Amino acid sequence: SMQIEKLRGAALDELFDAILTLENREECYQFFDDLCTVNEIQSLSQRLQVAKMIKQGYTYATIEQESGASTATISRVKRSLQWGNDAYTMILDRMNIETN
Protein backbone atom coordinates (compact mmCIF):
# COMPACT_ATOMS: atom_id res chain seq x y z
CA SER A 1 0.00 0.00 0.00
CA MET A 2 2.88 2.36 -0.82
CA GLN A 3 1.64 5.58 -2.44
CA ILE A 4 4.11 4.91 -5.28
CA GLU A 5 2.01 1.84 -6.30
CA LYS A 6 -0.09 4.35 -8.28
CA LEU A 7 2.90 4.87 -10.59
CA ARG A 8 4.32 1.34 -10.82
CA GLY A 9 4.93 0.47 -14.48
CA ALA A 10 7.55 0.39 -17.25
CA ALA A 11 8.54 4.08 -17.19
CA LEU A 12 9.08 4.21 -13.44
CA ASP A 13 10.94 0.91 -13.63
CA GLU A 14 13.23 2.47 -16.24
CA LEU A 15 13.99 5.50 -14.06
CA PHE A 16 14.99 3.22 -11.21
CA ASP A 17 17.01 0.94 -13.49
CA ALA A 18 18.77 4.08 -14.72
CA ILE A 19 19.64 5.20 -11.18
CA LEU A 20 20.99 1.68 -10.48
CA THR A 21 23.48 2.06 -13.35
CA LEU A 22 25.18 5.01 -11.61
CA GLU A 23 28.59 3.81 -10.42
CA ASN A 24 30.12 6.71 -8.51
CA ARG A 25 29.37 9.99 -6.82
CA GLU A 26 30.33 12.21 -9.73
CA GLU A 27 28.08 10.29 -12.12
CA CYS A 28 25.28 11.09 -9.66
CA TYR A 29 26.21 14.81 -9.80
CA GLN A 30 26.12 14.72 -13.60
CA PHE A 31 22.88 12.70 -13.85
CA PHE A 32 20.90 14.52 -11.19
CA ASP A 33 22.08 17.91 -12.50
CA ASP A 34 20.60 16.91 -15.89
CA LEU A 35 17.43 15.37 -14.43
CA CYS A 36 16.58 17.85 -11.67
CA THR A 37 16.56 21.52 -10.77
CA VAL A 38 18.80 22.90 -8.00
CA ASN A 39 15.70 23.39 -5.80
CA GLU A 40 14.58 19.81 -6.27
CA ILE A 41 18.05 18.39 -5.49
CA GLN A 42 18.37 20.66 -2.44
CA SER A 43 15.03 19.37 -1.08
CA LEU A 44 16.03 15.71 -1.48
CA SER A 45 19.37 16.38 0.18
CA GLN A 46 17.68 18.20 3.10
CA ARG A 47 15.22 15.35 3.61
CA LEU A 48 17.95 12.73 3.97
CA GLN A 49 19.87 14.99 6.41
CA VAL A 50 16.70 15.31 8.52
CA ALA A 51 16.15 11.55 8.53
CA LYS A 52 19.85 11.00 9.44
CA MET A 53 19.66 13.54 12.26
CA ILE A 54 16.43 12.12 13.71
CA LYS A 55 18.03 8.70 13.75
CA GLN A 56 21.20 10.13 15.34
CA GLY A 57 18.96 11.37 18.14
CA TYR A 58 18.97 15.14 17.68
CA THR A 59 16.13 17.41 18.81
CA TYR A 60 13.91 18.87 16.07
CA ALA A 61 15.10 22.33 17.19
CA THR A 62 18.71 21.31 16.43
CA ILE A 63 17.72 19.71 13.11
CA GLU A 64 16.19 23.02 11.94
CA GLN A 65 19.42 24.87 12.73
CA GLU A 66 21.96 22.40 11.26
CA SER A 67 20.16 21.10 8.15
CA GLY A 68 18.35 24.33 7.26
CA ALA A 69 15.21 22.23 6.71
CA SER A 70 11.82 23.87 7.34
CA THR A 71 9.45 22.67 10.07
CA ALA A 72 7.05 21.41 7.37
CA THR A 73 9.87 19.36 5.81
CA ILE A 74 10.93 17.91 9.17
CA SER A 75 7.22 16.99 9.72
CA ARG A 76 6.97 15.15 6.39
CA VAL A 77 10.22 13.26 7.11
CA LYS A 78 8.94 12.41 10.64
CA ARG A 79 5.80 10.91 9.07
CA SER A 80 7.88 8.89 6.57
CA LEU A 81 10.14 7.42 9.29
CA GLN A 82 7.20 6.30 11.38
CA TRP A 83 4.62 5.48 8.71
CA GLY A 84 6.82 4.51 5.75
CA ASN A 85 8.93 1.71 4.26
CA ASP A 86 11.88 1.82 6.66
CA ALA A 87 13.96 2.69 3.63
CA TYR A 88 15.74 5.56 5.33
CA THR A 89 16.80 2.99 7.95
CA MET A 90 17.94 0.48 5.33
CA ILE A 91 20.17 2.95 3.53
CA LEU A 92 21.51 4.86 6.57
CA ASP A 93 22.43 1.49 8.10
CA ARG A 94 24.33 0.55 4.91
CA MET A 95 26.47 3.67 5.08
CA ASN A 96 27.36 2.86 8.70
CA ILE A 97 25.77 6.02 10.08
CA GLU A 98 25.86 5.90 13.89
CA THR A 99 22.13 6.03 14.69
CA ASN A 100 21.25 6.15 18.40
Place this chain on the structure above:
Amino acid sequence: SMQIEKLRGAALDELFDAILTLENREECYQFFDDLCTVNEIQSLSQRLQVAKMIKQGYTYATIEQESGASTATISRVKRSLQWGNDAYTMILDRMNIETN
Protein backbone atom coordinates in the same frame (compact mmCIF):
# COMPACT_ATOMS: atom_id res chain seq x y z
CA SER B 1 29.81 25.27 -14.16
CA MET B 2 27.01 22.76 -13.56
CA GLN B 3 24.14 24.45 -11.69
CA ILE B 4 24.49 21.73 -9.02
CA GLU B 5 27.90 23.24 -8.08
CA LYS B 6 25.81 25.68 -5.98
CA LEU B 7 25.00 22.71 -3.70
CA ARG B 8 28.16 20.59 -3.80
CA GLY B 9 29.23 19.56 -0.31
CA ALA B 10 28.97 17.00 2.45
CA ALA B 11 25.14 16.74 2.54
CA LEU B 12 24.71 16.27 -1.20
CA ASP B 13 27.60 13.80 -1.29
CA GLU B 14 25.76 11.86 1.40
CA LEU B 15 22.53 11.79 -0.67
CA PHE B 16 24.42 10.39 -3.65
CA ASP B 17 26.35 7.90 -1.50
CA ALA B 18 22.93 6.73 -0.22
CA ILE B 19 21.62 6.32 -3.76
CA LEU B 20 24.74 4.31 -4.73
CA THR B 21 23.95 1.81 -1.92
CA LEU B 22 20.65 0.81 -3.61
CA GLU B 23 21.05 -2.72 -5.01
CA ASN B 24 17.84 -3.54 -6.87
CA ARG B 25 14.71 -2.06 -8.36
CA GLU B 26 12.40 -2.79 -5.42
CA GLU B 27 14.76 -1.05 -3.00
CA CYS B 28 14.43 2.00 -5.29
CA TYR B 29 10.64 1.79 -5.00
CA GLN B 30 10.89 1.69 -1.21
CA PHE B 31 13.54 4.41 -0.90
CA PHE B 32 12.06 6.89 -3.32
CA ASP B 33 8.57 6.30 -1.92
CA ASP B 34 9.98 7.36 1.50
CA LEU B 35 12.05 10.22 0.05
CA CYS B 36 9.64 11.76 -2.48
CA THR B 37 6.00 12.47 -3.12
CA VAL B 38 4.06 10.67 -5.85
CA ASN B 39 4.03 13.92 -7.86
CA GLU B 40 7.83 14.34 -7.63
CA ILE B 41 8.50 10.73 -8.68
CA GLN B 42 6.10 11.01 -11.62
CA SER B 43 7.88 14.18 -12.76
CA LEU B 44 11.28 12.52 -12.70
CA SER B 45 9.99 9.43 -14.54
CA GLN B 46 8.41 11.63 -17.22
CA ARG B 47 11.65 13.54 -17.81
CA LEU B 48 13.61 10.37 -18.46
CA GLN B 49 10.88 9.06 -20.82
CA VAL B 50 11.06 12.33 -22.74
CA ALA B 51 14.86 12.16 -22.96
CA LYS B 52 14.74 8.58 -24.27
CA MET B 53 12.04 9.37 -26.82
CA ILE B 54 13.88 12.47 -28.10
CA LYS B 55 17.02 10.38 -28.54
CA GLN B 56 14.99 7.71 -30.41
CA GLY B 57 13.74 10.32 -32.89
CA TYR B 58 10.11 10.81 -31.78
CA THR B 59 8.52 14.22 -32.49
CA TYR B 60 7.11 16.45 -29.72
CA ALA B 61 3.48 15.47 -30.46
CA THR B 62 4.13 11.74 -30.01
CA ILE B 63 6.11 12.45 -26.86
CA GLU B 64 3.23 14.52 -25.42
CA GLN B 65 0.80 11.66 -26.21
CA GLU B 66 2.90 8.81 -24.71
CA SER B 67 4.54 10.40 -21.67
CA GLY B 68 1.95 12.98 -20.58
CA ALA B 69 4.62 15.67 -20.75
CA SER B 70 3.82 19.32 -21.42
CA THR B 71 5.64 21.21 -24.23
CA ALA B 72 7.44 23.14 -21.43
CA THR B 73 8.74 19.94 -19.80
CA ILE B 74 9.80 18.59 -23.22
CA SER B 75 11.57 21.88 -23.98
CA ARG B 76 13.55 21.75 -20.74
CA VAL B 77 14.62 18.16 -21.38
CA LYS B 78 15.67 19.07 -24.90
CA ARG B 79 17.78 21.95 -23.54
CA SER B 80 19.50 19.62 -21.08
CA LEU B 81 20.29 17.17 -23.92
CA GLN B 82 22.08 19.87 -25.88
CA TRP B 83 23.81 21.83 -23.10
CA GLY B 84 23.91 19.52 -20.05
CA ASN B 85 26.23 16.74 -18.92
CA ASP B 86 25.26 14.15 -21.52
CA ALA B 87 24.13 12.03 -18.58
CA TYR B 88 21.00 10.74 -20.25
CA THR B 89 23.26 9.41 -23.04
CA MET B 90 25.40 7.72 -20.37
CA ILE B 91 22.55 5.85 -18.65
CA LEU B 92 20.70 4.98 -21.87
CA ASP B 93 23.86 3.37 -23.20
CA ARG B 94 24.19 1.27 -19.99
CA MET B 95 20.62 0.01 -20.23
CA ASN B 96 21.34 -0.92 -23.86
CA ILE B 97 18.47 1.21 -25.12
CA GLU B 98 18.89 1.88 -28.83
CA THR B 99 19.17 5.57 -29.78
CA ASN B 100 19.94 7.64 -32.91
